Amino acid sequence: RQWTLEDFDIGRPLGKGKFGNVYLARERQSKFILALKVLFKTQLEKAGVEHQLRREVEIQSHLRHPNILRLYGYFHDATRVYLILEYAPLGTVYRELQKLSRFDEQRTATYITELANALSYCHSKRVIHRDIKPENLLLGSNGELKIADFGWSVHAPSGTLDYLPPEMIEGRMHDEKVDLWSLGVLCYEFLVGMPPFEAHTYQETYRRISRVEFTFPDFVTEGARDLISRLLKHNASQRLTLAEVLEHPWIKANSS
Numbered sequence: 310r311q312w313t314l315e316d317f318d319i320g321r322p323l324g325k326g327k328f329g330n331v332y333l334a335r336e337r338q339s340k341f342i343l344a345l346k347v348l349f350k351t352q353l354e355k356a357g358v359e360h361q362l363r364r365e366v367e368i369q370s371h372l373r374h375p376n377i378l379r380l381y382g383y384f385h386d387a388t389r390v391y392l393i394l395e396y397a398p399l400g401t402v403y404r405e406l407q408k409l410s411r412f413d414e415q416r417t418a419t420y421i422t423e424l425a426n427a428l429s430y431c432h433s434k435r436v437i438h439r440d441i442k443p444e445n446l447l448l449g450s451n452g453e454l455k456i457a458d459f460g461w462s463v464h465a466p467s468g469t470l471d472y473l474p475p476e477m478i479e480g481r482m483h484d485e486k487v488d489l490w491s492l493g494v495l496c497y498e499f500l501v502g503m504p505p506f507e508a509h510t511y512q513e514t515y516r517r518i519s520r521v522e523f524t525f526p527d528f529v530t531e532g533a534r535d536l537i538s539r540l541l542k543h544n545a546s547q548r549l550t551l552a553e554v555l556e557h558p559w560i561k562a563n564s565s
């Protein structure tokens with residue numbers, strides 16, 4: 310179907326960045342509710358990202374998983390590009406973490422399981438996400454995690470610095486293990502309420518990631534310390550596999 314903007318009723322903003330806003334939308338004919346992200350062509354070409362966008366759409370025509378948000382298609386006009394997305398009724402994990410401050414051990418491990426299942430599938434098709442962070446994790450109507458925004462994704466091998474591994478911040482070669490590090494940064498932020506290498510400047514953060522300089526607060530349990538520490542390894546190969554995450558005593562104990 311050759312979609313046009315007139316096929317939709319547009320509703321409230323769902324979110325917004327400086328690439329474009331996301332709006333609630335309803336397809337006029339079916340009454341189907343979805344999300345429309347409105348990207349400006351000027352912004353995309355002035356940043357030379359039009360190719361990464363074209364690849365995202367292409368990657369998202371193949372990926373089908375309950376824990377990956379759907380990109381149903383796209384259409385353009387004179388000035389803007391419109392992405393046709395699955396609506397995530399419970400919003401972002403980013404907003405949920407701001408509200409709750411931090412996540413208990415049970416909801417953390419459940420998210421990490423859902424994220425690990427999504428990434429396991431992605432890594433099978435040789436797709437690496439590279440941009441795992443709370444703002445790209447959204448919540449389905451049953452509170453289930455969905456990974457979103459495949460714009461920075463690539464086939465392996467190939468904002469803030471908080472979630473990026475050493476091999477990536479140092480402009481070097483990298484593979485799947487990128488997502489494995491980001492999963493460990495997430496586990497930590499879920500539990501603590503802030504990411505492990507947080508600093509007030511880009512340059513302090515960069516120093517902390519490459520030297521892997523992080524400490525745990527008192528309340529983090531030994532099983533969680535163990536998971537996170539086996540994930541946040543400078544040497545990519547030493548890290549841990551998704552299968553080792555999913556079969557981890559802490560995940561098994563606490564995941565629902």
Ligand SMILES: O=C(Nc1cccc(Cl)c1)Nc1ncc(CCNc2ncnc3ccsc23)s1
Nearest residue numbers: 323324328331344358361362396397457458460
């Ligand atoms: O942005 C891109 N690609 C992109 C953008 C700019 C440049 C390039 Cl190169 C690529 N892709 C995305 N895929 C999913 C996205 C999530 C949109 N947000 C939401 N979607 C559904 N429900 C809710 C509810 C709360 S927010 C929200 S964004």
